[PDB]
Amino acid sequence: TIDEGLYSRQLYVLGHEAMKQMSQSNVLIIGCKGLGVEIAKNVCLAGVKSVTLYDPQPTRIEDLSSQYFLTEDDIGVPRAKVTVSKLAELNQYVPVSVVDELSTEYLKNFKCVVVTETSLTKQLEINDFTHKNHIAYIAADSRGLFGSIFCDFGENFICTDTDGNEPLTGMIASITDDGVVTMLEETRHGLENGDFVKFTEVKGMPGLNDGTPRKVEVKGPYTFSIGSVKDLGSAGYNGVFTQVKVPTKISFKSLRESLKDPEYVYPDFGKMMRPPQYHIAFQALSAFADAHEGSLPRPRNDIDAAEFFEFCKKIASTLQFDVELDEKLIKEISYQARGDLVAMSAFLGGAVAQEVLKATTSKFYPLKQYFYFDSLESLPSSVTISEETCKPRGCRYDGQIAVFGSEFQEKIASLSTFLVGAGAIGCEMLKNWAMMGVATGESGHISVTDMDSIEKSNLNRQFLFRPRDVGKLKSECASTAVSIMNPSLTGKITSYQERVGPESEGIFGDEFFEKLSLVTNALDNVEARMYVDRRCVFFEKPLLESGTLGTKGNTQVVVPHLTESYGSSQDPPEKSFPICTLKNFPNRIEHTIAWARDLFEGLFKQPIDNVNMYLSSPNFLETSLKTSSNPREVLENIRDYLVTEKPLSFEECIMWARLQFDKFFNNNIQQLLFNFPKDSVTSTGQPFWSGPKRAPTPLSFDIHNREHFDFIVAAASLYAFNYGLKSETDPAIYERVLAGYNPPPFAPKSGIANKDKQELKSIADSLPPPSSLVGFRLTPAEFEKDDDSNHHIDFITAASNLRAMNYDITPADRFKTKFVAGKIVPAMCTSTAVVSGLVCLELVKLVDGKKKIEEYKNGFFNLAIGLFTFSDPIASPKMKVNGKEIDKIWDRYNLPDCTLQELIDYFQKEEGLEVTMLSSGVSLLYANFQPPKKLAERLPLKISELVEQITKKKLEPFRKHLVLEICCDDANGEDVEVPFICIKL
Amino acid sequence: ALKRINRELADLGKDPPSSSSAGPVGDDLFHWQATIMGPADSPYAGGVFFLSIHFPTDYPFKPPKVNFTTRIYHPNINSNGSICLDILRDQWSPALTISKVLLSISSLLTDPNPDDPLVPEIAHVYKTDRSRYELSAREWTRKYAIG
Ligand SMILES: Nc1ncnc2c1ncn2[C@@H]1O[C@H](COP(=O)(O)OP(=O)(O)OP(=O)(O)O)[C@@H](O)[C@H]1O
Ligand SMILES: [Mg+2]
Ligand SMILES: [Mg+2]
């Protein structure tokens, strides 16, 4: 009974079984500070059975540094009581409660236990009980710019899926008697040594078709080995192999045992000697807190740092750690002991929430066991950080002042950012900015733009939106929510509803972009990302890109004159199947789904567009006759949808649906088998219907079958919608009408002057004149995946399943059909939190104005295997132009609005280059091979006038510059790249 | 985008294809109208075939859309002009030029591939009765590719 209308995007990552097992697990959370509240929010959005909170300490002002459910009116009230009320509204299926006192036996009521902001002795006491009773125990800690995660899921944890990937499957060319299995041409299986596979549909070796998994010995990118198959047969031809994923057993250790001899997880290989330092440092922090009534070292205090270092030495000696302590790093940990950042809190909360989901669902590979992380590269160096500057001021930003100081706080408070999009990443970014105090100063400002509207499925990962806000604009709701979180941002946020693209340059013009400080992208498509990147490159503003895909995520930072732009990097694009594969010879369900989508477009969308355009354009037929690729097809569609087969009731729609079933699933297959019989052979003598090509078989219409009836119902409903008729769903009428249908005979045809124009004219004149039909319009069917009452995905699923039945392919349910046809991108709340945390850790680097390139880190991570990696950004390439150093990306030529001849002369005399091609937008303004008449007509004109003449559109009043792409040759004719030109109108 | 398009255009201009001639439509760089000359050792001899090439906005990271305009009787070309070439659907890489595409299409015209056809009826005619395929191809290339 999973509510697929709410967990639609998450179920593509986890699955039905995982969520079914997750909806029966209880989670206890000890500590309700920023990290605790983040973990609770992520878990509540995930969909666990219930969440319990325990934090009876009274609220303080500094706690608001990373808590977004606490307000300044809540000082003196326990955090759990004032947090449960606001946590209960995130998800309606997940009750949230509060417990005043914690008893050891009570821990048996929960499936997972998360511990934050607790002393080491209490953690040991809890773990000593949660280990021997088989309870997952996750301990998290956040100190300034440092974080620690510890996981313990018992001594007999069972991991069903260790990587989260789909099983590898492939086709087989030949199998030798020595067990050497060979793939098809240019086909890589991707297996690894030790994997288990099973074979099916193997001809000549039936024994391998039993289904028992066998070992894999990788011998090359195209072949592998399974052992000895001497008994089963001699040689095997064709077949399909599929990987089998087996459960694994993972054994952890208790906290007491792992303190002495831990097992680290390294988040970065450039600094491998640090985690041993952090292991001592955090224990020393806990000991110091125990030795000062729970008081952590004061920020940037020398005496407390010395005492903490003495404790570190004592602990290192006690545990017989043969590691030399790094004094600088340990004292840095001491200085930032009272820090509380929202970015680190979000990062660790996402990580720990993912660990909780792993523990509850017994899925994905967990951390084993310690995970120590630091982002010390984010510490400002352009401001004075000392004990005086980092002391608290009795304000809500104490947790951040204790790390960065008051001067950097003032620098943040005067930011002028621009956030593109208001999705999940946008909501998280806005929350982080509100907590950090971005643009709370006099000169600050925030701009958020997004044109989409809130839907039901967006509430799962976008915590700023509530069910009462379904149907409204995202930007306004997000701005209101973040103004509620931080009252100081009232009037400092502007929310637009404009799509960022070529048509919005009248609002996001030079004046708007000349006052910004940085641009942060929260988009989900490549075109808008590239456009924003081009705008940032032109205006020279720092850019923050972030992307997620299921459990994977990446973050990139673009810095002017330092690093390359987003468009200089390429990602693997989507794979589009060959037309011959989709049209005639499919061999996978994706081919059938694509064919069904094309059929839907060709049956319910394009003909209606042609009919509507015919009745509007007075000269449509003449234009189509000499412009459209297939005028005959357009004429036939118009005739059929206007006069020949215009329905007058729903019964005629049912008859048409039956006729289309016959046309597409019974007749074309007969034609194909008449052209290529099942016993036909290729040119080399091999059978034609072998390997990737599967022999089809025509379908006979049986009303009692579920799939045939589903196709009929969906097609009839869509046709009635197109013609604006009244549809019905009672099977009685369908069974009554379809009984009295006489199938027209069909026999495949073997085949064996300029009158075509006459025939087309005869078809055209048969159409009624447009004047006769005034106000008669047909409704095109616009594909919408999220609506379940329009029969779109139903029709696609029915058609795909029927075509799969044609070719003996495994049919797919509505869930996978919606996933494939709709291009749905899997998404998670934890990944969004992690990417937001990383981006906000890069933001403080950008604000400080760091100049070196080794201080920035592009980040990548995969939460399925607990993988985190950080690398330096790629430096922008340099080049030699006229014996000078030119930056390839961030350099341009600034010129007035001079004539084209003057521009050529300037490039010839200054740069010593001969201009050969000059373009702007999508037009070719000037080229070296154009006829001399055209150039002589265009040479004495200014650039603005030339663009106006070529593009046939006047320059808008708001336009103030032109971007020209110029390719020029040197004196010897050798091509040399040059930066673009910025003509100033 | 524009830079790569013009580099390919200049390479075509400097190096004469001698069997093809690709040029932009009007003054638009994202729409070309190329021409292909019928191979000598093929039924399509003495014919001129026009192709429309639409460069996607993400070029060269996405394959161009090449569609025949002159009707041709070929097993791997349907009535819409779509061409069955591996380098245009999923094997496209940002390292192939328009001259390479035109050479590939010319090679396809030189010898069709009926084992994986796009028009089953023409493929069947080609496989069974070669003379009828030759006659039909000559008739089509005389009716459409000439004049
Ligand atoms: N060119 C653009 N200009 C402005 N906002 C954009 C642009 N392209 C996308 N967006 C916005 O970026 C946000 C992307 O967030 P997200 O993809 O998570 O949401 P969604 O597309 O509505 O949801 P889903 O992908 O789950 O169906 C959406 O608000 C979308 O409206
Ligand atoms: Mg949406
Ligand atoms: Mg989206």
Side-chain angles (χ1 to χ4, degrees):
Chain A
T1 174
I2 305 301
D3 190 2
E4 300 181 353
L6 182 59
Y7 304 107
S8 181
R9 307 299 182 270
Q10 175 182 137
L11 283 169
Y12 297 137
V13 187
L14 292 183
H16 296 269
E17 172 60 29
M19 288 213 63
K20 174 178 178 298
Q21 191 167 351
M22 195 165 61
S23 68
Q24 302 170 344
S25 305
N26 301 326
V27 178
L28 168 62
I29 301 178
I30 303 173
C32 291
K33 292 192 67 178
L35 182 56
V37 76
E38 175 63 24
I39 296 170
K41 174 202 69 178
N42 290 329
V43 168
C44 287
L45 295 181
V48 305
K49 180 178 179 181
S50 69
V51 177
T52 305
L53 306 163
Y54 173 83
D55 196 4
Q57 298 299 337
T59 308
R60 297 183 310 277
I61 175 62
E62 53 268 10
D63 293 5
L64 282 70
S65 301
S66 55
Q67 258 277 29
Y68 40 94
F69 292 145
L70 308 183
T71 60
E72 294 214 12
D73 299 318
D74 300 325
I75 309 301
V77 195
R79 292 187 287 264
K81 296 187 179 302
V82 293
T83 311
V84 58
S85 60
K86 295 181 180 60
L87 274 173
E89 301 180 7
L90 291 173
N91 195 331
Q92 58 174 340
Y93 304 101
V94 183
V96 186
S97 178
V98 164
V99 282
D100 294 327
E101 67 164 9
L102 224 191
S103 58
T104 305
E105 286 72 11
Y106 191 72
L107 298 176
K108 271 185 293 185
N109 289 339
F110 304 106
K111 186 69 171 300
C112 188
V113 178
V114 181
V115 181
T116 63
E117 315 300 338
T118 316
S119 58
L120 192 70
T121 60
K122 281 294 298 181
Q123 293 189 21
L124 289 175
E125 177 184 357
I126 295 177
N127 183 266
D128 290 0
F129 179 82
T130 62
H131 184 63
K132 61 185 179 65
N133 291 85
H134 303 296
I135 303 177
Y137 171 91
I138 306 177
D141 200 9
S142 178
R143 296 294 191 264
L145 287 162
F146 307 89
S148 73
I149 300 179
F150 173 81
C151 300
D152 173 20
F153 300 158
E155 289 191 353
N156 298 274
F157 187 69
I158 293 296
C159 179
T160 62
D161 191 357
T162 55
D163 45 354
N165 303 327
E166 300 294 334
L168 298 174
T169 175
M171 309 186 65
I172 301 176
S174 179
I175 299 176
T176 71
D177 206 357
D178 299 358
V180 179
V181 177
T182 300
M183 298 289 96
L184 289 176
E185 55 274 5
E186 302 297 341
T187 309
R188 293 182 177 85
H189 43 69
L191 294 172
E192 301 174 356
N193 303 86
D195 292 330
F196 292 87
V197 299
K198 59 180 178 181
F199 307 92
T200 42
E201 293 188 1
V202 181
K203 291 186 288 294
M205 287 184 171
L208 283 79
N209 299 330
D210 60 332
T212 307
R214 303 177 183 271
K215 287 296 299 303
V216 174
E217 175 179 348
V218 178
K219 305 180 66 59
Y222 302 98
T223 60
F224 60 95
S225 177
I226 61 178
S228 301
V229 289
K230 188 64 61 177
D231 58 325
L232 300 182
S234 180
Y237 304 94
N238 296 319
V240 48
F241 92 95
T242 301
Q243 184 183 6
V244 173
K245 317 189 73 175
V246 292
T248 317
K249 192 183 72 60
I250 305 177
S251 182
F252 291 86
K253 291 187 296 182
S254 57
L255 189 57
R256 187 180 307 277
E257 298 179 14
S258 69
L259 282 184
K260 312 170 189 177
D261 182 66
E263 177 177 353
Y264 312 94
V265 171
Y266 302 92
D268 197 4
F269 292 160
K271 29 193 171 183
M272 295 276 291
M273 311 293 291
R274 289 190 173 184
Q277 316 291 341
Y278 297 160
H279 190 63
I280 310 301
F282 277 87
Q283 301 177 30
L285 248 182
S286 181
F288 181 86
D290 288 359
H292 287 258
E293 298 88 20
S295 301
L296 296 175
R298 291 159 290 182
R300 299 290 168 181
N301 208 325
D302 309 335
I303 307 175
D304 293 0
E307 194 169 348
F308 175 81
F309 192 73
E310 298 296 342
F311 280 120
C312 286
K313 274 182 171 172
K314 178 184 299 305
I315 286 187
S317 66
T318 302
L319 300 181
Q320 291 82 16
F321 261 94
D322 304 326
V323 52
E324 181 183 3
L325 296 180
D326 190 5
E327 180 174 346
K328 311 304 295 179
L329 188 64
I330 281 180
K331 289 188 172 181
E332 258 296 335
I333 293 180
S334 178
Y335 294 147
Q336 310 169 7
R338 281 194 175 184
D340 187 3
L341 306 182
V342 62
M344 285 295 299
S345 298
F347 177 86
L348 299 185
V352 174
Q354 187 66 32
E355 299 309 321
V356 171
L357 303 191
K358 294 178 182 174
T360 53
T361 64
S362 298
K363 196 180 179 63
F364 299 142
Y365 194 87
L367 301 182
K368 190 173 183 303
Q369 304 184 204
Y370 277 98
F371 174 85
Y372 291 108
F373 172 79
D374 74 322
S375 181
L376 194 59
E377 310 95 31
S378 297
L379 192 61
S381 65
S382 63
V383 300
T384 303
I385 296 178
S386 66
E387 188 176 10
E388 175 61 23
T389 46
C390 293
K391 69 178 177 56
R393 304 181 306 177
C395 65
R396 50 175 296 169
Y397 311 108
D398 286 329
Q400 188 179 37
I401 293 177
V403 182
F404 295 152
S406 65
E407 304 185 11
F408 197 88
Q409 178 56 222
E410 295 178 352
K411 285 189 176 185
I412 288 186
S414 61
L415 263 191
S416 182
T417 64
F418 178 58
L419 177 62
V420 194
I425 307 179
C427 286
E428 289 288 345
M429 214 66 58
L430 275 172
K431 173 205 66 179
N432 290 338
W433 291 354
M435 293 294 99
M436 288 172 56
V438 174
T440 62
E442 300 298 332
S443 58
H445 198 77
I446 297 180
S447 302
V448 48
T449 163
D450 190 4
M451 71 302 180
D452 195 2
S453 302
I454 305 175
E455 300 178 2
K456 183 174 184 57
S457 56
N458 306 132
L459 307 183
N460 180 255
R461 61 189 178 284
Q462 303 176 358
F463 68 102
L464 289 181
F465 305 145
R466 297 295 182 265
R468 60 177 179 271
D469 294 356
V470 174
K472 298 179 62 178
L473 300 180
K474 288 185 174 179
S475 56
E476 279 75 2
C477 295
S479 70
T480 303
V482 302
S483 299
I484 293 297
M485 283 184 177
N486 193 333
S488 298
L489 286 180
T490 297
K492 316 295 290 185
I493 305 176
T494 304
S495 49
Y496 304 100
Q497 52 172 336
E498 310 293 344
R499 174 197 294 266
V500 179
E503 291 73 7
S504 63
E505 302 190 5
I507 309 176
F508 306 137
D510 296 64
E511 290 80 15
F512 177 72
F513 259 94
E514 280 174 2
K515 298 178 295 185
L516 299 178
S517 295
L518 55 92
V519 182
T520 304
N521 287 22
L523 306 167
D524 64 335
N525 60 109
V526 183
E527 177 185 7
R529 284 196 182 99
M530 295 297 180
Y531 175 83
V532 176
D533 171 54
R534 290 199 298 264
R535 296 292 291 179
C536 291
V537 167
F538 180 86
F539 286 102
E540 291 179 344
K541 299 300 178 187
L543 178 69
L544 293 173
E545 292 287 349
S546 54
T548 72
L549 177 62
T551 50
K552 311 181 192 63
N554 73 276
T555 69
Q556 180 177 357
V557 53
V558 181
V559 186
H561 293 284
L562 191 65
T563 65
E564 66 178 16
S565 60
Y566 176 81
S568 300
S569 302
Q570 289 310 297
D571 310 327
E574 297 290 345
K575 290 288 104 178
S576 55
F577 308 101
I579 44 181
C580 35
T581 297
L582 302 179
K583 221 289 184 176
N584 293 120
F585 320 101
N587 60 83
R588 295 211 307 270
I589 199 69
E590 293 82 14
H591 304 152
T592 61
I593 296 171
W595 177 87
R597 175 59 190 271
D598 288 48
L599 176 65
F600 168 86
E601 297 293 347
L603 284 187
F604 303 108
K605 200 269 187 300
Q606 294 183 2
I608 305 299
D609 286 358
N610 289 337
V611 171
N612 283 12
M613 192 175 181
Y614 170 81
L615 293 184
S616 297
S617 170
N619 200 28
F620 173 76
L621 296 175
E622 287 68 13
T623 55
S624 66
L625 182 61
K626 58 184 179 298
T627 305
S628 61
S629 58
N630 282 14
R632 181 178 186 83
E633 179 186 4
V634 180
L635 295 176
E636 290 179 359
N637 293 332
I638 295 175
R639 172 175 55 87
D640 296 332
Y641 281 75
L642 276 184
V643 52
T644 300
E645 285 183 333
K646 181 180 179 301
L648 298 180
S649 179
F650 191 73
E651 286 69 5
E652 300 193 10
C653 297
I654 301 174
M655 298 284 285
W656 178 88
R658 171 68 169 89
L659 177 55
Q660 296 305 322
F661 174 93
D662 237 17
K663 269 173 50 54
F664 286 109
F665 302 111
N666 185 20
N667 291 334
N668 60 337
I669 299 301
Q670 286 185 8
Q671 189 74 11
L672 181 56
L673 295 181
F674 176 80
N675 299 148
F676 292 109
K678 289 192 175 183
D679 61 77
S680 65
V681 299
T682 65
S683 301
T684 65
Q686 302 294 336
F688 186 89
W689 299 105
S690 62
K693 298 176 179 57
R694 315 174 68 96
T697 167
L699 294 180
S700 302
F701 183 78
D702 195 359
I703 182 62
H704 291 356
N705 197 330
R706 188 186 74 264
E707 206 65 60
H708 305 171
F709 184 72
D710 290 354
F711 174 84
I712 294 300
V713 170
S717 301
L718 286 180
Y719 205 66
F721 166 77
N722 275 25
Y723 275 92
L725 301 182
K726 187 62 176 57
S727 57
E728 302 177 8
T729 58
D730 52 321
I733 176 178
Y734 290 103
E735 297 184 15
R736 174 175 56 89
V737 176
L738 292 179
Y741 176 84
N742 303 329
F746 176 78
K749 60 174 187 298
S750 59
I752 308 180
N754 301 330
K755 59 178 180 59
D756 301 353
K757 183 216 67 53
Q758 184 65 19
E759 180 176 352
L760 297 185
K761 263 59 180 60
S762 67
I763 292 292
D765 56 56
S766 303
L767 308 175
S771 300
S772 178
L773 297 178
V774 175
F776 178 83
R777 291 291 194 267
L778 299 179
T779 311
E782 306 294 344
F783 181 74
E784 179 63 23
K785 59 183 185 306
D786 291 333
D787 188 1
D788 297 325
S789 300
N790 50 15
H791 315 275
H792 293 184
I793 299 300
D794 302 2
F795 170 83
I796 293 188
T797 304
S800 172
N801 291 18
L802 291 179
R803 187 167 184 82
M805 292 169 57
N806 256 341
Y807 290 86
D808 294 329
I809 313 182
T810 299
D813 52 327
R814 179 177 286 95
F815 197 67
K816 182 181 177 181
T817 303
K818 182 183 176 183
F819 173 74
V820 173
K823 271 73 178 59
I824 296 179
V825 183
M828 207 79 177
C829 48
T830 67
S831 308
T832 304
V834 175
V835 297
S836 67
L838 298 181
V839 170
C840 294
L841 286 177
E842 240 75 33
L843 187 142
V844 294
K845 298 175 184 175
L846 276 179
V847 170
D848 188 64
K850 295 180 176 298
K851 300 296 178 59
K852 307 303 294 298
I853 196 176
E854 307 100 17
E855 299 165 351
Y856 297 89
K857 292 296 189 301
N858 302 337
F860 171 84
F861 66 92
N862 177 20
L863 295 181
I865 58 180
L867 174 72
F868 295 84
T869 169
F870 302 88
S871 61
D872 290 4
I874 295 296
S876 56
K878 304 294 187 303
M879 73 201 309
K880 290 294 184 179
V881 176
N882 194 27
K884 290 178 294 184
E885 189 82 347
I886 287 296
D887 203 328
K888 251 189 180 63
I889 308 178
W890 300 92
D891 279 331
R892 75 278 271 99
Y893 284 104
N894 289 284
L895 305 177
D897 190 11
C898 60
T899 63
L900 177 58
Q901 182 60 29
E902 280 197 8
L903 182 137
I904 292 181
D905 295 358
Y906 159 85
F907 263 79
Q908 184 67 19
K909 190 179 93 297
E910 259 67 5
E911 314 300 333
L913 308 175
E914 176 184 3
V915 184
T916 54
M917 165 251 189
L918 186 64
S919 64
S920 176
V922 298
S923 304
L924 181 70
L925 305 183
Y926 169 76
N928 194 287
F929 54 86
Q930 293 188 350
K933 169 183 61 54
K934 190 185 301 304
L935 302 184
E937 186 274 339
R938 291 178 177 181
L939 278 186
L941 300 179
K942 299 191 300 181
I943 301 298
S944 64
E945 299 180 359
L946 184 57
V947 174
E948 290 178 1
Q949 178 177 353
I950 289 186
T951 59
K952 302 297 181 58
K953 178 178 61 55
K954 300 298 299 305
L955 293 179
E956 294 78 344
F958 58 81
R959 198 80 64 179
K960 298 179 65 177
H961 63 257
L962 295 177
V963 178
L964 275 57
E965 305 293 332
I966 169 176
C967 298
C968 58
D969 303 358
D970 203 321
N972 302 93
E974 303 297 338
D975 194 333
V976 47
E977 290 198 11
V978 286
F980 64 92
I981 305 176
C982 172
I983 295 293
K984 181 174 298 308
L985 301 178
Chain B
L2 303 172
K3 322 197 73 172
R4 180 59 176 175
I5 291 172
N6 181 82
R7 290 174 205 282
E8 290 179 348
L9 178 53
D11 181 68
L12 291 176
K14 297 176 182 178
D15 176 64
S18 78
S19 182
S20 309
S21 60
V25 175
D27 288 323
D28 195 339
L29 289 177
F30 288 97
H31 186 186
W32 293 21
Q33 187 170 11
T35 290
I36 292 183
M37 188 65 61
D41 54 357
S42 64
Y44 316 98
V48 177
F49 305 95
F50 290 93
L51 291 71
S52 60
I53 309 176
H54 296 285
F55 294 99
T57 317
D58 313 339
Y59 188 84
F61 312 135
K62 298 181 68 59
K65 292 184 60 178
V66 178
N67 293 91
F68 262 80
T69 301
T70 299
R71 300 291 297 270
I72 185 178
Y73 184 82
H74 197 262
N76 291 113
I77 299 175
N78 60 335
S79 302
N80 296 327
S82 299
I83 314 174
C84 225
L85 247 55
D86 50 353
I87 60 182
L88 296 175
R89 297 292 299 187
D90 51 338
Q91 207 181 3
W92 171 259
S93 62
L96 298 178
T97 60
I98 294 300
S99 185
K100 292 291 185 177
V101 176
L102 300 179
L103 179 59
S104 303
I105 298 172
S106 182
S107 63
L108 175 70
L109 261 67
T110 304
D111 55 332
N113 181 20
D115 294 2
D116 193 1
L118 186 57
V119 188
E121 45 268 8
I122 303 176
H124 177 249
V125 172
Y126 176 90
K127 291 172 64 58
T128 59
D129 192 0
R130 196 61 168 268
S131 61
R132 178 50 54 182
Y133 165 80
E134 297 279 334
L135 265 297
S136 297
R138 293 188 190 281
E139 170 57 29
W140 278 64
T141 192
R142 182 177 59 85
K143 186 187 299 179
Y144 298 95
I146 293 180

